[PDB]
Design a protein around this nucleic acid. Structure first.
Ligand SMILES: [Mg+2]
Ligand SMILES: [Mg+2]
Ligand SMILES: [Mg+2]
Ligand SMILES: [Mg+2]
Ligand SMILES: [Mg+2]
Ligand SMILES: [Mg+2]
Ligand SMILES: [Mg+2]
Ligand SMILES: [Mg+2]
Ligand SMILES: [Mg+2]
Ligand SMILES: [Mg+2]
Ligand SMILES: [Mg+2]
Ligand SMILES: [Mg+2]
Ligand SMILES: [Mg+2]
Ligand SMILES: [Mg+2]
Ligand SMILES: [Mg+2]
Ligand SMILES: [Mg+2]
Ligand SMILES: [Mg+2]
Ligand SMILES: [Mg+2]
Ligand SMILES: [Mg+2]
Ligand SMILES: [Mg+2]
Ligand SMILES: [Mg+2]
Ligand SMILES: [Mg+2]
Ligand SMILES: [Zn+2]
Lengths: 178, 77, 134, 177, 57, 119
RNA sequence: UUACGGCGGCCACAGCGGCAGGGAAACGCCCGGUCCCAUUCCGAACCCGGAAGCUAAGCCUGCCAGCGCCGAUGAUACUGCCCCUCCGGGUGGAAAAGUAGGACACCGCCGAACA
RNA sequence: UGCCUCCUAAAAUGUAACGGAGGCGCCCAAAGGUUCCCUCAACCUGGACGGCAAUCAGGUGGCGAGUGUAAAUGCACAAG
RNA sequence: GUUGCGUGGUUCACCGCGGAGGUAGAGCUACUGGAUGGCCGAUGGGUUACUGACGUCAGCCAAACUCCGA
């Protein structure tokens, strides 16, 4: 039982009915999945995303990612079709709540010169995306066993209908917004 | 004078189309519709063929129909 | 007037039979020239009729050309025998059937408008007439 | 006001429509509220005059073999070259329904400055009771600068008459030159 | 596919220099992750030229 | 919705195998409809659309069978394997319904292959 | 007889959208991953074991012509044959478009509640 | 100059010109067989590098994508 | 074409019934292109009188356009 989940159904599940007046408890929003990907565009050249993007997202998240191939060739990017350019992991269930708790507690303040995340980065339904800029945010990877530094952007897909409904959920979980 | 050096050629006409019309009595094995693609689809007692050739599997009578937008050829034994 | 692309550079002739079933009333303006017989109206003939209407009213008013020359006609080189390919396209032509409104005009004076259109009909290879908005 | 004497057609077709026109008559139909359509002749010049006055809407009183019937003119088929009525669509009315009618917009005003006045639509389709049907509804220009353009919205239409065309039909546009 | 391809993943204790301690499931070998700053002790989590001339004189 | 996705996707799979499998008078079609609690089965004869035999888990004989949901799939597999033989049927074609062959549906199918039906 | 669950015919007059209401058994979301089985990563899905919760959604029912769809009668275009120098005419067929309108489907077998 | 596809070609088939447009003399051990599963392009919103457009997430989208290769006839049930 | 030997109404015409079409015509916010006048206005240009995309409102065209269709 991950501790961000038992904290979710204790007071977060009940505080949302009093802010947004739902009739039924099957309308209370909940985060369904957290998707992290790298997007290693500098792997069309030199073809080294093996130790780079695969072996650190296994250490950050806990399971081995999927490698995403390119769908159409773009000449200016020197990109050919069917060439690995992206590395993606998808987190459900207990490994999701154990990622979001580990992200907001000990990782999201390790951003250099951190003054909060924007609360306007919702797409229109209540799904939040923000981008990390380095791997040293996480202790689970080390600076001395890695290749070149690379960032990642993290989707948090919720059951929310609109944005401020999804903003009130992630505020109650512990996302820091400015 | 110039020339039509770029034109002047054609392939042979392939004799495509309906070979047995509606209500017409056929034998087993008779070719009903010769076509490119499925302009017509098989029905009951009709098979497609290797180059979409819609023959007869059973002696009977040819009847045309509709089956969810597609037009089909069937045999009533 | 000339198209900027055609899909087919060499075409058959448009067919001069029938009565016009579309474009047979005055839509845009007040006065209109209506065709009474079949002809091929080239783009050189339309521009001679546009400058003939515009130089008789000289300012004030609005001229509509609801006819475009997008059908090409071909021509062999000059002193040639018959038949070693189709000739290169030379003319641009609109197919004009009886009933088809060709030009439309708005002008405040009825006399000058009806006289500016008469000068256009003497620039066209058709018998035509002037009609109004019923 | 419009006494129009009709007679029921005997035989119908391509041949009988031509023979009725050589007698100066106009073929037409009368279809209305859920009835079978009537096939009937028109006296021609007496029908051509009654729409030459009174507009084209012009509520008609018919004489269908001794029987009286009120009819609006739904559609006309004009020959493109002879400019003569070939066929008429007449629909019955009863003393006020919300039937739909296009009616001409006449334009008033003076383009004082360097302004040309252009009109795009000639008639708006309003809905009104089936015996009033105003002759035309006007529009005016107060000396409009090249600019502000008048629309089907902000037209002057009386009581009972409702705009159901579109409230954005540009009826008059004013420009430079 | 959910067998011996994924990295090892078991229970892991996290402590901060502030005095925070809680218990998650992570990939650190031994389960002894130690942070210098966390969600409890970080800033942002708890928090004129006319006066320049006046200060000189 | 996840149920709106699941209904459309399983009847798209069920139309996918319907292109190659019909069911006739001599050889009816054993259609299974599997839910989270019960399973249903019937023999449909797709020439006039007339069911000739049916069985389910909601009737009181299968309702009082002990065990998991696979033990109640064998019992309903036994019932249509005799209501068909009472109706004069000894060969059928098996219809997945759009589900995967295996688990509870294969246990219905193995109870029907032992008690007389010959697919 | 059902504001029931299936399987078909049928493939928009049947769709798409809007607004309401529905939960006996059933259909579902749902709660879990020990066992069969599963993810180019993920028990999301597929599969299995369950019945704490709920009609919010699907599904069903009713109402809306809104966007789509169907669409005459008459007339015209075109046309077979014939007469006729053209023009046109006689006889036999006859659109597309638009209009009057229609339409928020209908039918069959099995199961359940009721008969 | 042989073969293949379209228009001419006059709603079966067939139809000429030194008439109007194009392709072929290959390629694939999978791009064959079967079994099962999936739905596209485009547009919109959000997102470290990252741009009109790489990878991601949510919408919308009944086929405008795709099909080894010309074109026609087909194929969303998929033949993708 | 004719003639010998066979076969016999199987040929042909009209009436009725069952069938497949994509020509004439017509239509195009049903596709691919061409294209007139407006309105809106991407961006380009010289700070905004010029270009005026995509859309939308009317009227049109096509052997190699077709939702239709004799
Ligand atoms: Mg050919
Ligand atoms: Mg072959
Ligand atoms: Mg037209
Ligand atoms: Mg119940
Ligand atoms: Mg689960
Ligand atoms: Mg509800
Ligand atoms: Mg008719
Ligand atoms: Mg029609
Ligand atoms: Mg022919
Ligand atoms: Mg032919
Ligand atoms: Mg060649
Ligand atoms: Mg293979
Ligand atoms: Mg090939
Ligand atoms: Mg395939
Ligand atoms: Mg006959
Ligand atoms: Mg017939
Ligand atoms: Mg026919
Ligand atoms: Mg064609
Ligand atoms: Mg034509
Ligand atoms: Mg166009
Ligand atoms: Mg424009
Ligand atoms: Mg055509
Ligand atoms: Zn601390």
């Amino acid at each position: 039982q991950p501790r961000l989940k038992e904290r979710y159904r204790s007071e977060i599940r009940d505080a949302l009915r009093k802010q947004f007046g739902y009739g039924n408890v099957m309308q209370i929003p909940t985060v369904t999945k957290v998707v992290v990907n790298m997007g290693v565009g500098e792997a069309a050249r030199d073809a080294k995303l093996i130790n780079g993007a695969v072996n650190d997202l296994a250490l950050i998240t806990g399971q081995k990612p999927e490698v995403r191939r390119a769908r159409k060739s773009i000449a200016q990017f020197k990109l050919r079709e069917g060439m690995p350019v992206g590395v993606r992991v998808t987190l459900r269930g207990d490994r999701m709540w154990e990622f979001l708790d580990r992200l907001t507690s000990i990782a999201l303040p390790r951003i250099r010169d951190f003054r909060g995340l924007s609360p306007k980065q919702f797409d229109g339904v209540g799904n939040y995306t923000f981008g990390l800029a380095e791997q040293a945010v996480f202790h689970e990877v080390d600076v001395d066993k890695i290749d070149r530094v690379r960032g990642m952007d993290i989707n948090v897909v919720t059951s929310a209908a609109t944005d401020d409904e999804g903003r009130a959920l992630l505020r109650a979980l512990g996302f820091p917004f400015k | 004078g110039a020339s039509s050096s770029r034109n002047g050629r054609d392939s042979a006409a392939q004799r495509l189309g309906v070979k047995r019309y509606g209500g017409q009595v056929v034998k087993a094995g008779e070719i009903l519709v010769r076509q490119r693609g499925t302009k017509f689809h098989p029905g009951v007692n009709v098979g497609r063929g290797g180059d979409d050739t819609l023959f007869a599997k059973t002696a009977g009578a040819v009847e045309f129909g509709i089956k969810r937008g597609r037009k089909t050829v069937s045999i009533v034994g | 007037l000339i198209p900027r692309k055609v899909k087919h550079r060499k075409q058959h002739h448009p067919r001069q039979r029938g009565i016009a079933s579309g474009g047979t009333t005055v839509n845009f303006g007040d006065y209109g020239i209506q065709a009474l017989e079949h002809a091929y109206v080239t783009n050189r003939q339309i521009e001679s009729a546009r400058i003939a209407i515009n130089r008789h009213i000289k300012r004030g008013g609005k001229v509509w050309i609801n006819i475009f020359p997008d059908r090409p006609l071909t021509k062999k080189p000059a002193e040639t025998r018959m038949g070693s390919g189709k000739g290169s396209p030379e003319w641009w032509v609109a197919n004009v059937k009886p009933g088809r409104v060709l030009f439309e005009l708005s002008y405040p004076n009825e006399g000058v408008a009806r006289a500016a259109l008469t000068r256009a009909i003497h620039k066209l290879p058709i018998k035509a007439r002037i009609i109004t908005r019923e | 006001s419009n006494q129009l004497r009709v007679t029921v057609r005997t035989e119908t077709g391509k041949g009988a429509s031509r023979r009725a026109r050589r007698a100066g008559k106009i073929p037409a139909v009368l279809y209305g509220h859920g009835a079978e359509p009537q096939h009937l002749e028109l006296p021609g010049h007496d029908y051509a005059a009654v729409l030459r006055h009174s507009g084209t809407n012009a509520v008609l009183t018919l004489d269908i073999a001794g029987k009286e019937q009120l009819a609006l003119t739904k559609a006309l088929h004009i020959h493109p070259i002879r400019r003569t009525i070939q066929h008429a669509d007449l629909l019955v009315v009863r003393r006020g329904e919300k039937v739909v009618v296009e009616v001409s917009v006449v334009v008033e005003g003076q383009a004082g400055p360097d302004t040309l006045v252009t009109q795009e639509t000639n008639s708006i389709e309003i809905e009104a009771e089936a015996l009033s049907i105003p002759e035309q509804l006007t529009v005016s220009i107060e000396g409009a600068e090249p600019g502000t353009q008048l629309t089907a919205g902000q037209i002057a239409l009386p009581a009972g008459v409702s705009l159901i065309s579109d409230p954005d039909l540009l009826v008059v546009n004013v420009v430079k030159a | 596919m959910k067998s011996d391809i994924h990295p090892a993943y078991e229970e892991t204790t996290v402590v901060c220099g502030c005095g925070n301690t809680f218990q998650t499931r992570s990939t650190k070998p031994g389960g002894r992750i130690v942070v210098e700053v966390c969600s409890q002790c970080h800033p942002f989590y708890t928090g004129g030229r006319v006066a320049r001339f006046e200060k000189r004189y | 919705s996840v149920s709106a996705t699941r209904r459309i996707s399983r009847l798209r799979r069920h139309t996918r195998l319907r292109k190659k499998l019909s069911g006739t008078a001599e050889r009816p079609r054993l259609v299974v409809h599997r839910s989270a609690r019960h399973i249903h089965v019937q023999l449909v004869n797709d020439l006039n659309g007339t069911t000739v035999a049916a069985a389910s888990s909601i009737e009181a004989d299968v309702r009082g069978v002990p065990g998991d949901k696979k033990a109640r799939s064998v019992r309903v597999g036994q019932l249509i394997a005799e209501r068909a033989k009472a109706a004069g049927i000894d060969t059928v074609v098996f219809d997945r319904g759009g589900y995967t062959y295996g688990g509870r549906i294969a246990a219905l199918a193995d109870a029907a292959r032992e008690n007389g039906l010959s697919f």
